Symmetry: C2
Subunit: 88 residues, 2 copies
């Protein structure tokens, strides 16, 4: 199942361009990041990015979930900022 | 930090009306659900629903995150349905 951490990690793959560079940004190891994705791909039933691809390419399902991330993550951020607004 | 499971659980509190009824829906115990929320409230820095309240009342921060859930969860659902569409 898709979690918020998977959506941010998908953004790191696009923003950093490789599994190793994104792992360095997310303070994780490269294998642990690869293990998290294949673990997610197994439960979802489809792959998120092209295996062995260099440069790394997303699958159509990965592009869909990346666009999902670009939409949900700013909304969660704005919601938590409103929760911490000096009011209510 | 807000997770997808926290957003669905917030919807269960509104849809079921109590911590005990929502726990039965989510296949969790009542204390484990209460432990998950106070755990989340501790890290966020604010409370999500009024303590001891009967009937259960959300705080203003809980209403904000509930409206967040009503917006994000359908988008995640539509994204996964598109991923499983017989195409791509
Ligand atoms: Mg993988
Ligand atoms: Mg609590």
């Amino acid at each position: 199942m898709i979690e918020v951490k998977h959506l941010k990690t998908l953004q790191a793959l696009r923003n950093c361009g490789s599994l190793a560079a994104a792992a360095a940004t997310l303070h994780q190891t490269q294998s642990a990041l690869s293990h998290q994705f294949s673990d997610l791909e197994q439960r979802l039933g489809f792959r998120l990015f092209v295996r062995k691809s260099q440069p790394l390419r997303f699958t159509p399902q990965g592009e869909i979930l990346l666009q999902l991330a670009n939409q949900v993550l700013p909304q969660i951020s704005q919601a938590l900022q409103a929760c911490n607004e000096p009011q209510q």
